[PDB]
Every structure is written in structure tokens, then in C-alpha cells.
């Protein structure tokens, strides 16, 4: 049964970059995408901001999790385009590291120089 | 005598622009400069953020004011460069519109499309 509520708040990122050459062509237009393969709603995403290497989203998402399935959070940092969007990086979070009732601020890192702040919590359905 | 403490918190700006052509050449690298000609320290400024059209500064400044002088706040939105920095816009605030003990959130506008959030307060010296 799916009985665990996994809340993810994507707060902000700092120094988003496509690389030296990539940034010269196009200032990153970042959004974040959240993916849990084991969850019933697999994929979610934040809005994008144009031309902002330190975007602030403060968007909150809720997943419904099965405690008996392997649940892993995939966080993808994206650059929006008119053409096809570009994947800048990906970081994973083992949700099995959290414990019920726990709320935690997690900082992820992309391409060594980019950081992202998340706030993760886990509760029962009620 | 200088006996009024005028506190200014520059919080953030949204959609900073140098214009259509200017933005294509250079994504704004914004900072804010504060100027009160009648104050003993005339000029102050925030740090800049590279390539960020929605910068967040949250920097607090303190001016000392003479209640018998005309005190007007000049807010200049700047773009940082290696060369000479460029002036994007200027907005004024009559400090004689504030009351002692009053604390107020003010939103300024530059070039019709750029907004800036300030937090202004006025107290007497302790
Ligand atoms: C290199 C010289 C300028 C190229 C450039 O980045 O500006 C053009 C514009 C800039 O695109 P951008 O400012 O990044 O804004 C669009 C962002 N999206 C696609 C997410 C709405 O995109 C196109 O029109 C092509
Ligand atoms: C198309 C035109 C490309 C200009 C450009 O933005 O890329 C070059 C980069 C632009 O510098 P930028 O990323 O805006 O930031 C330099 C750091 N500041 C803004 C403090 C001078 O370095 C320059 O010397 C100009
Ligand atoms: Ca651009
Ligand atoms: Ca861009
Ligand atoms: Ca883009
Ligand atoms: Ca640039
Ligand atoms: Ca720039
Ligand atoms: Ca600049
Ligand atoms: Mg920003």
C-alpha cells in the first residue's frame, strides 16, 4: 500500500552553469524536475526563470510512497529552451535515509560548482 | 543636529533589463546604489550578482539624518562591468513621507518593466 507522504520543497539554486562556452551562448534559464520511479505520479517540475543563474522557486511537491518499494529521488537541473531543453545535471537522494516525522534541509551539487537547496520531509498518510 | 536613523533594506529586484539589444550582449549583473545628498555618508551600495535578472541582496544600510534638512533617497539600479558600470535607472523616495517608528515595504519601478522591493524604517537615535 502507498501510505508514506514524501514532501519536497525546491527552494533555490546558486551559480547554475552550462559551462564556460555554454554560458556565453545562453544564460541558463533554469527549472528543476523531480522523478521517483516507484511513485504513482512519476514526474514533476518547477517553473523556469529566464536568465537567472541563482533562481529562487520555493515550490512544494508531494509524492505518495510505498514503504516496501525502493524509493529513490532523482533531481534534474534543467535549462529551458524554445527548441529542446538541456539537461545540466542530475543528483539522487535515497529516501530510505529519512525517517518519519523528520524534516531536513538538503544541499545538492551539480557540475562541482552549482548548488541547490531542498527541504525534504516524510510523514504517514493519516 | 543629526538625530534620525533611516534604515534601508534592499531586498530584491525582478526582471532587471538593459533593454532588448543590451540583454543580448550582456545579461545584467545588478547591484543597487543608495544616495542621500543631505546625509553625512552620501553613498552606499550592495554587492553585485553576475548574470541574474532577479537578484536577491537582503542587505541593510543605515543613514543618519537631519530632520531640518530636505532628505531625499536616490536609488540607482546598476549593472556591473569590467569596464565602466552602467546606469540602468534611478528612482527617488521622499523620506519626509515616513513617520517615526513606521516600517514600510516599498516597491520601486525602473524602465516600466523592472521592479525592486525595499523595506524602509525611521527611528530616532537611541
Ligand atoms: C549569442 C547571441 C544572443 C543569443 C541569445 O541568447 O539571445 C536570443 C534569445 C534569448 O533567449 P533567452 O533569453 O534565454 O530567453 C528565452 C528563454 N526561454 C526559451 C526559456 C523562454 O533566444 C533566441 O531568440 C534564439
Ligand atoms: C555575445 C557577447 C558576449 C559577451 C559576454 O557576456 O561573454 C563574455 C563575458 C561576460 O561577462 P559577465 O559574465 O557578464 O560577467 C563578468 C563579471 N562582471 C559582470 C562583474 C564584470 O566576459 C566578457 O569579458 C564580456
Ligand atoms: Ca540569453
Ligand atoms: Ca537564456
Ligand atoms: Ca536556455
Ligand atoms: Ca553574460
Ligand atoms: Ca553579464
Ligand atoms: Ca554587466
Ligand atoms: Mg536570482
Author numbering:
A (entry chain B), B (entry chain A): 15 to 140
What do the authors report?
Arachidonic acid generated by cPLA2α is a precursor of pro-inflammatory eicosanoids, including certain prostaglandins and leukotrienes. Complexation of two Ca2+ ions by the C2-domain neutralizes several Asp residues, facilitating protein docking and penetration into the membrane interface region.
However, using purified Gallus gallus (chicken) cPLA2α C2-domain (81% identical and 93% highly conserved sequence relative to human), we obtained crystal complexes with 1,2-dihexanoyl-sn-glycero-3-phosphocholine (DHPC), enabling structure determination at 2.2 Å resolution. In contrast to the two bound Ca2+ ions reported in the lipid-free structure, we observed three Ca2+ ions coordinated in the PC-bound structural complex, consistent with the established Ca2+ dependence of membrane interaction by the C2-domain. Although Ca1 does not coordinate with the DHPC molecule, Ca4 does interact with two oxygen atoms of the DHPC phosphoryl group in bifurcated fashion (2.1 and 3.7 Å). Importantly, the Tyr96 aromatic ring stacks in planar-like fashion with the cationic -N+(CH3)3 group.
